[PDB]
Structure 1
Amino acid sequence: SLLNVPAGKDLPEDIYVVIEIPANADPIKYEIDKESGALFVDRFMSTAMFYPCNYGYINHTLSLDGDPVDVLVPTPYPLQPGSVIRCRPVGVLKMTNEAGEDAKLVAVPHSKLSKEYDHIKDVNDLPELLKAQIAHFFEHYKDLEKGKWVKVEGWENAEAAKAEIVASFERAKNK
């Protein structure tokens, strides 16, 4: 099952992200259910907005807000929902919604899948336009969602990204 995917080969620099939502997809937000492992429809987003990158989670991790660390994963072509990609974390985008702190890591395909992301070691190496586009996306994608709201605190580095993976991996191994 998707529930038995390792967190990574070598955490926190060598991790697996379970893809839930492909880059550039229609605006359906899917979630792996932690009970069945199946792909569930969470909602049909009301804005005319698309995820700017592939969107998923690291298995066996528990972020401060009670669920797995979310990850955005840029790729030359959109991935399949339910596929697992080997990645390297490179950066984190801090935000608050109406559940508190909810960081989104950014991680690039690992060098064994591809050499293309090898120049990207830290948050400053991501294209400006891509960072601006991502932030705008999480700023606005819920604008028409009555019970929901989001505030974007800003970008941090790969070491802040890694420390979140370790803290969330440890917290899953007790709680």
Structure 2
Amino acid sequence: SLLNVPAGKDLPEDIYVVIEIPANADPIKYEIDKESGALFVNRFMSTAMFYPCNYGYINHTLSLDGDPVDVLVPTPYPLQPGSVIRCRPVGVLKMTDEAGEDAKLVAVPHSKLSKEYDHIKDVNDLPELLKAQIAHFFEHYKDLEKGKWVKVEGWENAEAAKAEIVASFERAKNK
């Protein structure tokens, strides 16, 4: 099942992301249920917004907020919910939310899957417009949700991204 995917062939440089929400999809927020492995509807989003990249998580990781590390993966075409993609982390979007700090990684497809992202080694190599669309989306997609808000602190580099993965993987085994 999806519950049995490895975090990575060679963490933290080489990771697998389980995709929950495709890029440019209808505003349905899917999540994988950690008990069954099944795709569940978490909610229907109320803003007219879509994820600018595919979104999901790295399995067998536990971040400080209790869930697996979440990741945005740009792809040339949207992926299926439930599918697993081999990626390399490239940066981290840091936010503070109603429950305090949040981080969302950005990871690009592994060169085995595509050469299109070989030149993106770090957070400065992502297109500016994509980064602005990512930040704008996380600032506004919960606007019409009562008692929730998000605010962006800014981007950090591939090394900071890798540290969050390691820290949350090691955390997942004992805790």
Q: Distance in 2 between matches of 1:101 and 1:59?
A: 21
TM-score (norm 2): 0.99
Q: What residue in structure 1 maps to residue 83 of structure 2? A: 83
- The two structures, once aligned, show a CA RMSD in angstroms of 0.6
Deviations 1:108-162 (A, max 9, x none): 0000001000000000000000000000000000000002111111100000000
Q: In 2, are the aligned partners of 1:7 and 1:15 still within 8 Å (CA)?
A: yes
Q: In 2, are the aligned partners of 1:71 and 1:107 still within 8 Å (CA)?
A: yes
Deviations 1:73-92 (A, max 9, x none): 00000000000000000000
Deviations 1:23-46 (A, max 9, x none): 000111111010101111111111
Q: What residue in structure 2 maps to residue 127 of structure 1? A: 127
Kindly indicate whether residue 66 of structure 2 is the aligned counterpart of residue 71 of structure 1.
no
Correspondence list, 1:14-163, <5 A: 14-163=14-163
Of 92-101 and 124-133, more deviation after overlay is shown by 92-101
> What displacement does 1:102 show?
1.6
TM-score (norm 1): 0.99
Provide runs of 4+ in structure 1 moved above 3 Å.
Answer: none
Q: Distance in 1 between matches of 2:101 and 2:83?
A: 27
> What displacement does 1:96 show?
1.6
- The percent of aligned pairs where both chains have the same amino acid is 99
> What displacement does 1:100 show?
2.2
Q: Distance in 2 between matches of 1:155 and 1:29?
A: 24
Secondary structure at the counterpart of residue 49 of structure 1: coil
Structure 1: 5+ residue stretches without partners: none
> What displacement does 1:101 show?
1.8
Q: Distance in 2 between matches of 1:61 and 1:113?
A: 23
> What displacement does 1:99 show?
2.3
Deviations 1:44-87 (A, max 9, x none): 11100000000000000011111000000000000000000000
Matched residues, number: 175
Q: Distance in 1 between matches of 2:96 and 2:65?
A: 10
Secondary structure at the counterpart of residue 163 of structure 1: helix
Q: In 2, are the aligned partners of 1:64 and 1:101 still within 8 Å (CA)?
A: no
Q: Distance in 1 between matches of 2:112 and 2:62?
A: 27
Secondary structure at the counterpart of residue 25 of structure 1: coil
> What displacement does 1:97 show?
1.5
Q: Distance in 2 between matches of 1:42 and 1:77?
A: 24
Of 46-55 and 97-106, more deviation after overlay is shown by 97-106
